[PDB]
Write an enzyme that holds these catalytic residues in place. Structure first.
Site, PDB file in Angstrom:
ATOM      1  N   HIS A  79       0.807  -1.230   0.000  1.00  0.00           N
ATOM      2  CA  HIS A  79       0.000   0.000   0.000  1.00  0.00           C
ATOM      3  C   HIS A  79       0.846   1.289   0.000  1.00  0.00           C
ATOM      4  CE1 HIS A  79      -3.227  -2.901   1.159  1.00  0.00           C
ATOM      5  NE2 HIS A  79      -3.813  -2.221   0.181  1.00  0.00           N
ATOM      6  N   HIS A 119      -6.636   7.032  -3.094  1.00  0.00           N
ATOM      7  CA  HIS A 119      -7.524   6.084  -2.422  1.00  0.00           C
ATOM      8  C   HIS A 119      -6.864   5.286  -1.286  1.00  0.00           C
ATOM      9  CE1 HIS A 119      -5.687   2.797  -4.656  1.00  0.00           C
ATOM     10  NE2 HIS A 119      -6.344   1.980  -3.860  1.00  0.00           N
ATOM     11  N   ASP A 237      -8.521  -1.579  -8.270  1.00  0.00           N
ATOM     12  CA  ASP A 237      -7.913  -1.955  -6.983  1.00  0.00           C
ATOM     13  C   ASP A 237      -7.662  -3.490  -6.906  1.00  0.00           C
ATOM     14  OD1 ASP A 237      -6.934  -1.060  -4.522  1.00  0.00           O
ATOM     15  OD2 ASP A 237      -8.904  -1.185  -3.501  1.00  0.00           O
ATOM     16  N   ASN A 240      -4.731  -6.796  -9.842  1.00  0.00           N
ATOM     17  CA  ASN A 240      -3.404  -7.424  -9.878  1.00  0.00           C
ATOM     18  C   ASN A 240      -3.431  -8.819 -10.579  1.00  0.00           C
ATOM     19  OD1 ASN A 240      -2.431  -5.163  -8.362  1.00  0.00           O
ATOM     20  ND2 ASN A 240      -2.433  -6.384  -6.491  1.00  0.00           N
ATOM     21  N   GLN A 288      -3.819 -17.136  -3.245  1.00  0.00           N
ATOM     22  CA  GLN A 288      -4.123 -16.484  -4.519  1.00  0.00           C
ATOM     23  C   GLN A 288      -5.279 -17.131  -5.235  1.00  0.00           C
ATOM     24  OE1 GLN A 288      -3.289 -13.423  -5.698  1.00  0.00           O
ATOM     25  NE2 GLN A 288      -2.370 -13.359  -3.625  1.00  0.00           N
ATOM     26  N   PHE A 291      -8.426 -16.079  -3.443  1.00  0.00           N
ATOM     27  CA  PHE A 291      -8.685 -14.663  -3.738  1.00  0.00           C
ATOM     28  C   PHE A 291      -9.320 -14.512  -5.120  1.00  0.00           C
ATOM     29  CE2 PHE A 291      -6.538 -10.459  -4.961  1.00  0.00           C
ATOM     30  CZ  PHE A 291      -7.467  -9.677  -4.260  1.00  0.00           C
TER      31      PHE A 291
END
Ligand SMILES: COc1ccc(C2=NN(C3CCN(C(=O)CN4C(=O)CC(C)(C)CC4=O)CC3)C(=O)[C@@H]3CC=CC[C@H]23)cc1OC
Ligand SMILES: [Mg+2]
Ligand SMILES: [Zn+2]
Length: 330
Positions: A79, A119, A237, A240, A288, A291
């Site tokens: 971040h 953000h 956001d 990725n 991953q 996710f």
């Protein structure tokens, strides 16, 4: 010499990819002397003619951007300013999707891009739940409610008050009020606690989708327009796993470093270790795949339906990456 340095020339050549999914953002970060957010934002503003449209003085823009970037923490693995730059650029690509051509006003475009840039500003590298459980000052300031996200907004706006930083100084009050509301609505929608409701609403919109003559989305009220922008930045956001694998894996390394650090803090303190944050009981690869399966693929599949067929290559890349990570699970 009124001509670029060689390093500035190499950077300018990388920035020719600014309209492409898969921009070499880490290389831009290195080449720009850790100014990816400033250089990518400036390029985008110029490209979209936002300086002229909103009468933004160039020096004011650059001063604000450097200030904003300076408030991202360089000691935070994920971040940080590179993530901010990446979300900005990914939003910029999504705004150019053929299915949205001529849908959004210049003010809405400004809102989506500015929201993307601010953000995650001043993110400490720990989650909302960690801040709440530790009785942190931020959690007390925001009454435990979208703590980080409220903070990012407050900082992003407060920085406009620094010396020669008010990029909105020539907007009318009406433009400013509208911009501000949209920015707030977009950043608050980046809190993952809102994801399921955002996705439900995006699905409803796909189910009742209207297109104009020429087959661009029809959005004729604020609720629908802002819902689309909120989901767009939220997709950015969560972009990725949709990028080429060499980029994706760097993002994975970074988020895991960040999560593991938080887990180390939680363990030191005798707290329950948050999901994916225990370095001794992790599977990076299984995490991953989870996710993707539970969060990223349901969102991007729904976005892809909304803009069909514009996001097919993005969805294919996501599905290829998911298979790659699945194949590396022992
Ligand atoms: C590059 O990979 C990642 C990038 C960002 C994130 C973020 N994590 N989160 C939360 C997302 C939801 N979440 C889950 O664990 C959800 N989930 C899974 O992803 C896998 C599972 C544990 C097996 C089952 C499940 O339900 C908690 C963490 C954030 O809030 C961050 C801030 C904003 C956006 C996303 C970002 C995670 C990545 O890989 C795990
Ligand atoms: Mg965030
Ligand atoms: Zn983010």
């Amino acid at each position: 010499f009124g001509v670029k340095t060689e390093q500035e020339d190499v950077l300018a050549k990388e920035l020719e990819d600014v309209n492409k999914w898969g921009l070499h953002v880490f290389r831009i970060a290195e080449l720009s002397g850790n100014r990816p957010l400033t250089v990518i934002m400036h390029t985008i503003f110029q490209e979209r003619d936002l300086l002229k449209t909103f009468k933004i003085p160039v020096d004011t823009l650059i001063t604000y951007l450097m200030t904003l970037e300076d408030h991202y923490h360089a000691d935070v693995a994920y971040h940080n300013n590179i993530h901010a730059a990446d979300v900005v650029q990914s939003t910029h690509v999504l705004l150019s999707t053929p299915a949205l051509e001529a849908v959004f006003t210049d003010l809405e475009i400004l809102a989506a891009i500015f929201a993307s840039a601010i953000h995650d500003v001043d993110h400490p590298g720990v989650s909302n739940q960690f801040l709440i459980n530790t009785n942190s000052e931020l959690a007390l300031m925001y009454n435990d409610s979208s703590v980080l996200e409220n903070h990012h907004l407050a900082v992003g706006f407060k920085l406009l008050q620094e010396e020669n930083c008010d990029i909105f100084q020539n907007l009318t009050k009406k433009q400013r009020q509208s911009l501000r509301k949209m920015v707030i609505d977009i950043v608050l929608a980046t809190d993952m606690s809102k994801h399921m409701n955002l996705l439900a609403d995006l699905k409803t919109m796909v189910e009742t989708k209207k297109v104009t003559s020429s087959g661009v989305l029809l959005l004729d009220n604020y609720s629908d327009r802002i819902q689309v922008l909120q989901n767009m930045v939220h997709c950015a956001d969560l972009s990725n796993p949709t990028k080429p694998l060499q980029l994706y894996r760097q993002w994975t390394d970074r988020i895991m470093e960040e999560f593991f650090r938080q887990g180390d803090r939680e363990r030191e303190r005798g707290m329950e270790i948050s999901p994916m944050c225990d370095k001794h009981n992790a599977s990076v690869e299984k995490s991953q795949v989870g996710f993707i399966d539970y969060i990223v693929h349901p969102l991007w599949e729904t976005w892809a339906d909304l803009v069909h067929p514009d996001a097919q290559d993005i969805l294919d890349t996501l599905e290829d990456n998911r298979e790659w990570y699945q194949s590396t699970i022992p």
